[PDB]
Amino acid sequence: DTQLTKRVKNAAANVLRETWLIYKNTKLVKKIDHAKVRKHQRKFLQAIHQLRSVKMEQRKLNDQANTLVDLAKTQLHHHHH
C-alpha cells in the first residue's frame, strides 16, 4: 500500500524533526523556552502515535491475510498460518 508507506515516511520524518527540536530546545540553549518545548512535545507525540497506528494496521492486515491462508489450508491438526 502506497498510502500506508506515505504515512510512515511523513510520520518518521516528523519524529526526527521533533526529537531534534526538543533536544535543541532543552539541551543546546541558554534559556529553555517551555512554550516551545510544549509545542514540539505535542508534535512529537503526534508523530510517534502515527507510527504506532501504522504498525498496528500492518499487524491487522497481516492477520487478515493469515486468515485467508488458514482457510485455504483447510482444503489440504491445531496448527495455524
Binding site: 500500500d1 498510502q3 500506508l4 491487522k60 492486515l61 487478515q64 491475510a65 493469515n66 486468515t67 485467508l68 491462508v69 482457510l71 485455504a72 489450508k73 483447510t74 482444503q75 489440504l76 491445531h78 496448527h79 495455524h80 498460518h81
Partner: protein
C-alpha cells in the same frame, strides 16, 4: 514436504472456489469481503484492497489463481497454537487459579458460541478431568490436545 505436491495445488484450486463465489475465475474485493465476514472478521474497503494489492501481479485489481499462489508460498509454515488455546480457556477461569470446574465448563459450553450439547460436554469432561476430581487443569488439557 518441500513447498509443493501436486495434491496440494489440487486442493488449493478447491480453495479458490471457496473465494470465487461466481466462479468467474477471479476474486474481487466484494467476494473477499463476503468470505472474510463469513469468518466473523470485518475488513474495511481499504483493507480488502490492500489484501489484493499485496499480490496483485497484473494490477487489474483482482486476484487470479496464479497470484493466489505467491501469497501462500510466502507463508506455508505453520506453528503450534498451544498458548492461544490456553488463553481462550483462561477467559473462563473466574478466579485465575488454573482450574475451571466441570459445572462451569457445562455452563459455558451450553450457552456461549455455537455451543455443545450436554452429552458432548460429558465426553469433553471425561477426557479433560484427568484426576477425576471434577476440575479441569486447562493448561494440562491443552498440552495434551496439542502434544
Amino acid at each position: 514436504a518441500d513447498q509443493l505436491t501436486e495434491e496440494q495445488i489440487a486442493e488449493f484450486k478447491e480453495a479458490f472456489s471457496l473465494f470465487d463465489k461466481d466462479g468467474d475465475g477471479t476474486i474481487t474485493t466484494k467476494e473477499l469481503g463476503t468470505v472474510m465476514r463469513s469468518l466473523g472478521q470485518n475488513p474495511t474497503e481499504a483493507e480488502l484492497q490492500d489484501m489484493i494489492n499485496e499480490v496483485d501481479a497484473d494490477g487489474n485489481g483482482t486476484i487470479d489463481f496464479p497470484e493466489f499462489l505467491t501469497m501462500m508460498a510466502r507463508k506455508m509454515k505453520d506453528t503450534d497454537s498451544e498458548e492461544e488455546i490456553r488463553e481462550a480457556f483462561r477467559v473462563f477461569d473466574k478466579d485465575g487459579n488454573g482450574y475451571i470446574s466441570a459445572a462451569e465448563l457445562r455452563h459455558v459450553m451450553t450457552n456461549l458460541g455455537e455451543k455443545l450439547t450436554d452429552e458432548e460436554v460429558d465426553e469433553m469432561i471425561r477426557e479433560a478431568d484427568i484426576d477425576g476430581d471434577g476440575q479441569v487443569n486447562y493448561e494440562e488439557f491443552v498440552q495434551m490436545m496439542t502434544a
